[model samples]
Target: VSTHTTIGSFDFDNCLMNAAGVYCMTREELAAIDHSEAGSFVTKTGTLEERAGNPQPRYADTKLGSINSMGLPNLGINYYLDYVTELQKQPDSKNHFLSLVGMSPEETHTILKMVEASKYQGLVELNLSCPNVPGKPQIAYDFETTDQILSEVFTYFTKPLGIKLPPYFDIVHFDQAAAIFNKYPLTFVNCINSIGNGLVIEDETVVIKPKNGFGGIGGDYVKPTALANVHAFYKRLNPSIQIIGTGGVKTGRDAFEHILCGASMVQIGTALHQEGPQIFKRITKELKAIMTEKGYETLEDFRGKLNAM
Candidate 1:
């Protein structure tokens, strides 16, 4: 039964997860959940230094989903270390499972250095897909910049490193980027960072509240876009480059759909924000139920095995 499932380095009981920047608050909040079926907890995107980020009205409701230009706001790596340390001290904390670190592309080196220097954690996720500040575009979306960032960061850190990608580019560009990383041993590629340049409004004025006006859009709205990206990348890249699907996963069916398309594992961000942390447990229950009813004993029974004929 355990033979067909996997998450990170551990063979998971299931594949559902609360993607990065989901529910990260106090140690009490992290401790109060049921992680028995979860794969891992991807912490909020953090930087070497604390950032206040943009002002209020950062989030806006949309027809399909919400959009926000909150930038990469966080309390810095030091705060994260302290928070993880406290959690580790708990006797029941071991059930919390693996922890994944999220950091901006430009901050990759610094954050990597912090991970290497600290004994607190091991797994790390390089968030190359966040939209840039106003005129600046995120490096991950640009082929050359993505290559340079990955090349530089890989040299310093030997631990497993995963790159999150934006869904704005075409399949040609996606393959080009994937080809570059195939030269090096990358752990995986996170498919579809939020689709961006979407705007929202509050009161009577436009809600380009981000310091850069608009932010990336996530939720059910981006599912088709995200799925296509994953499908293309899976068909072209070496089977070795794992795809961690993200974007609009709200349920186990959404999660399974991505897995069938080629995602080995999936991530949930907006759903947790909208449904609360319990969403993790709910999705896992639904996924397992779906698998059992389908007569599949393990994740690999259908993972990336989509039959097009």
Candidate 2:
């Protein structure tokens, strides 16, 4: 069975890769993923300038999953832009993703305006759902602001663009958000960037240092919420706008469920951080085995075909 997938006009040999924050913070780390079993790689979300991020102990691994409040620590956007520009020149280079967002609306415009003029030729994922920043609200949650950002972004960003989204709990919210998104020419929407502000404890102490123990939750704790967001947006957004599923993926079955729920691509965060790059090869093998047993020939044979009782 084939595991091929596509986002917009670009094709991927495999559907799995590391999420934005994990395993993608540096050139060395990004190159590691380039050599892994992943079909493509995305850079850590870059801002207008490099940030020191939260204090130490901002991330912790729990028995169930993981938590992190790494407040958008990354080498500046120019660093990633130069790397991607150089990478796409290689003969065997697969199209890569550049994940970025400015710290504020004006800064966002400045960063995107920079990209709009650069020679970086590939997909761009605008991170609208970073929940770890101390006082910055997740952008996708505010319907008006999201609309405004996209309106301004599309006016100048001519390349294929997509947004990473936070999970929405209410059906009404799904309706409202989708209505707003349908107004734009988005290429895709990645659902459920960690459930914001979840607290985990051990021995009466908080697991992470940020927000006094509160951090974005991932791994097993978020599978249901992740799946719900993926499918909810799948059913709501325009068919032309694809879905990339993230959160709570650890095994082939989890990847299979994401595809079945309409994810064109799936990203790994907590699991990738825990297992290293080899997780892609293992998950690919497992997914192929499941596909073989199910008599499916390709991901599309089953993608978005979830059945309900």
* Candidate of highest TM-score: 2
Best by lDDT: 2
Which residue window of length 10 is worst by lDDT in model 2? 130-139
Task: List runs of model 1 lying over 4 Å from the truth.
Answer: 1-4, 32-37, 85-106, 131-136, 201-204, 211-213
lDDT of 2: 0.91
lDDT of 1 by residue, 1-309 (tens): 332355455444456666666665434445444353556556667777777767876776665776777656677767765676556566545312223334445555766777777665435577776643356676766777677777887787776667777785565786687688787666677788788777655676777655555777889889999888888788877776788788778888888889888887787878777877678778877777788888887778888887788
Q: What is the TM-score of candidate 2?
A: 0.97
**What is the per-residue lDDT of model 2 for residues 258-286, given as tens digits with 9 covering 90 to 100?**
99999999999999999999999999999
Model 1 TM-score is 0.86
TM-score of each: 0.86, 0.97
